[PDB]
Design brief:
Chains A, B: GO terms for molecular function: cytosine deaminase activity; ferrous iron binding; identical protein binding; isoguanine deaminase activity; zinc ion binding. Chains A, B: Its cofactor is Fe(2+); Mn(2+); Zn(2+). Chains A, B: Belongs to the metallo-dependent hydrolases superfamily. Cytosine deaminase family. Chains A, B: Its EC number is 3.5.4.1, 3.5.4.-. Chains A, B: Keywords: Cytosine metabolism, Hydrolase, Iron, Metal-binding, Zinc. This is part of a larger assembly, with 2 copies of chain A. In chain A, β8, α4 and β9 form a beta-alpha-beta unit. Chain A has 2 domains: about 120 residues, Urease, subunit C, domain 1 (Roll); about 300 residues, TIM Barrel, CATH 3.20.20.140. In chain A, α2 runs parallel beside α3 and α6 runs parallel beside α7. Chain A contains 13 helices and 18 strands. By secondary structure, chain A is of the alpha/beta class. In chain A, the strands form 4 sheets. Chain A has an 8-stranded parallel sheet with strand order 6-7-8-9-10-11-12-13. A 4-stranded mixed sheet of chain A has the order 3-2-1-4, with no helix packed on it. At the A-B interface, α6 and α7 of A face α5 of B. The complex binds 4-hydroxy-3,4-dihydro-1H-pyrimidin-2-one (2 copies) and fe (iii) ion (2 copies).
Chain lengths: ~425, ~425
């Protein structure tokens, strides 16, 4: 029966703050002039940072926890990954998908993630994973708001009954329409697939999230069609272009021309640093390109960009604990957003920007919003990132749904000394 | 009441010539065997060069004299330029446009330019500059034949009511249909915009002049659609592709294939050396590309190419005195047309080739043509270019409309000595 969050630090704000809770919502936020005493019904943030929940804007829960089954992706490429997944997709069962999705979802709850957008492969006449994921969505609702993207992994026009299956997925309840233009047989199929994707999103009033130009091909420019169609339909807010790794390889003049449209369109962008650094640059010898989209430039231009984990122990990525601060750490390094302020502001890439990408309507520490927030045992975004701190408490609807008792390290010198890695 | 131009040198001809004038036209041209005596009603070219008037095939009189208002183009790019112009376009007034256009037109008259093609931005529902320019066209007619290009600066398909405004501009009297495919949101809009541009030109019987591929993007190939559509409609002579700076970055094999079509199509090309060297190569670090289209190769292939000033003290260019010999000087250097003959023949790039680009029907020193010609105090094209000579006399309809008394330089050595920089 929590009534208040006290001694809280807030990004971009000076001092400590008190967050009053009432009926599962935030009733008011007031600044404090000093440290407040703890008491019953008060959750002490202990001068730690309080922020809305971490968000996972791009993950594949249907493939999670399947790395090496039946075989391993030896080349470390997107293309072999799809082929290795195809082998596993043929062996899927309802319970298998639910068990694995839930295992990763629990790690996400433990990591303060209360909003997740999972893509689900719908290039499968049986739609096995989709049916399973729709049940998981209902089951996990008390802890995570899960969005499902109908993702035509093998193409819309390049796979038998691809468009029909994509629409069937929407009729069954998928929240977002997906696409993968660079994987279609031809550039023309790629462009046409986007017109079909947008028509379905308008027909069913759904969001859009395209696996867009995930390839080191300077000629892969499907992103301009995604942005142009969004601008034409006046629906930028509901549209997302995931990856756009090809943008890392575009010449600067085209990119500058393109950026005007990206900003005017208002669409969202997702970069997946852990997976992008691994799968991109695989066709170069030396030097080897990084392959992440132009994150730094998007931020400088006011274009909404955010980070996703993409994969957790599957054909496209053998690692992960579904930790967003870890995803952010990799992104800041590869994108060279290493200035103090850029690092400190990094939290935006895994909180607010991701919420906008998911078109969330109830997100942020503000009066009237649901009492969904997490507490990090750190002074600010920089500190949280540097020390890769766990989530001390995760609060949803005004109730604690996860907590982590921090590790305790001691070094035995002339006398025992506690080490917290702070300066 | 001039009756004859005597002691004239002509490009590509040996000796001196006499040009007889009658009723505002050239009645006959006869070679002289020696120097002729001056007399009343005879304009003595004094063994200087006589050529048809200089031509300005590409300039923006609606933006001229506005550099820095309200702000300066800090990046020196085409893209920021459009954005800086957009700010100024919002502050345009009828008289403002007329005053500035006239200021530059007077410099052009002083510089022996009697034919000018100005682009006018018609991505403006009020069409303020266009209405002003249509009046300027009538006002300046006694001295300059002004062609107006309806230029959809912000795109045809990418700007609200862009196509409607473009057609309205033609209905109001614009002589040429413009376009800017590389600025459209997508490659498909770019190609479609060209089909619409050609349809309007045929519907109204107007010329075409496209701002074509003005970008350092090796994939910007709208020029092939411009040339193909012209060939299909059998209208090459009436079509111009301005800039084509992307051609500077094409691989050689595609360029060779393309050149066959360029020659067969018969379309015209305009290079704008002063502006191209400034705006192109801005996305390179080092080495930095020059960015002018393939002028030297076009000349070698018999493809009509010419030079324009493009901008005079505005968002895309802070300098200029609207001087064509200066434009030519820059072009010869950057394009490496530095052989004696190439330099001497350089005048063609600012006279005859530009007249063909404007589809002029009354141009050249020939019997029957209007008596429009200028006199340069130089021995040939090479000499005129090297010394950047002024226009001694500009004659139109057989009357002097401009004259420049040359500067007089003296050095005071053991005795005073006149210096004319000749060898
Ligand atoms: O096409 C893809 N499938 C799964 C992961 C990666 O994001 N790309
Ligand atoms: O698009 C353009 N507008 C003005 C000058 C330059 O020629 N390009
Ligand atoms: Fe993905
Ligand atoms: Fe121009």
């Amino acid at each position: 029966a929590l009534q208040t969050i006290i001694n809280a630090r807030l990004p971009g704000e000076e001092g400590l703050w008190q967050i009053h809770l009432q009926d599962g919502k935030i009733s008011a936020i007031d600044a404090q002039s000093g440290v407040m005493p703890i008491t019953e019904n008060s959750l002490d943030a202990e001068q730690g940072l309080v922020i809305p929940p971490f968000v996972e804007p791009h993950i594949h829960l249907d493939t999670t926890q399947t790395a090496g089954q039946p075989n391993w992706n030896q080349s470390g490429t997107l293309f072999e990954g799809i082929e290795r997944w195809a082998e596993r997709k043929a062996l899927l069962t309802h319970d298998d998908v639910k068990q694995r999705a839930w295992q990763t979802l629990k790690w996400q709850i433990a990591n303060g993630i209360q909003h997740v957008r999972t893509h689900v492969d719908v290039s499968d006449a049986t739609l096995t994973a989709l049916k399973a994921m729709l049940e998981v969505k209902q089951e996990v609702a008390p802890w995570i708001d899960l969005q499902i993207v109908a993702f035509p992994q093998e193409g819309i026009l390049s796979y038998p009954n691809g468009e029909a299956l994509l629409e069937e997925a929407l009729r069954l309840g998928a929240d977002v329409v997906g696409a993968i233009p660079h994987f279609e047989f031809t550039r023309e199929y790629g462009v046409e697939s986007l017109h079909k994707t947008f028509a379905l999103a308008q027909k069913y009033d759904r969001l859009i999230d395209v696996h867009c130009d995930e390839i080191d091909d300077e000629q892969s420019r499907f992103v301009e069609t995604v942005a142009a169609l969004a601008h034409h339909e006046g629906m930028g807010a509901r549209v997302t272009a995931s990856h756009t790794t090809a943008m890392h390889s575009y010449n600067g003049a085209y990119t500058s021309r393109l950026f005007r449209l990206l900003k005017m369109s208002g669409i969202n962008f997702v970069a997946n640093p852990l997976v992008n650094i691994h799968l991109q640059g695989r066709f170069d010898t030396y030097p080897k390109r990084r392959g992440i989209t132009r994150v730094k430039e998007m931020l400088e231009s006011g274009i909404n960009v955010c980070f996703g984990h993409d994969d957790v122990f599957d054909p496209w990525y053998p690692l992960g604990t579904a930790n967003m601060l870890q995803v952010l750490h990799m992104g800041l390094h590869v994108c060279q957003l290493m200035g103090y302020g850029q690092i400190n502001d990094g939290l935006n890439l895994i909180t607010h920007h991701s919420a906008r990408t998911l078109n969330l309507q109830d997100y942020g520490i503000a009066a009237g919003n649901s009492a969904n927030l997490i507490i990090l045992p750190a002074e600010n975004g920089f500190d949280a990132l540097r020390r890769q701190v766990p989530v001390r408490y995760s609060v949803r609807g005004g109730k604690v749904i996860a907590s982590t008792q921090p590790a305790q390290t001691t070094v035995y010198l002339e006398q025992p000394e506690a080490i917290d890695y702070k300066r």
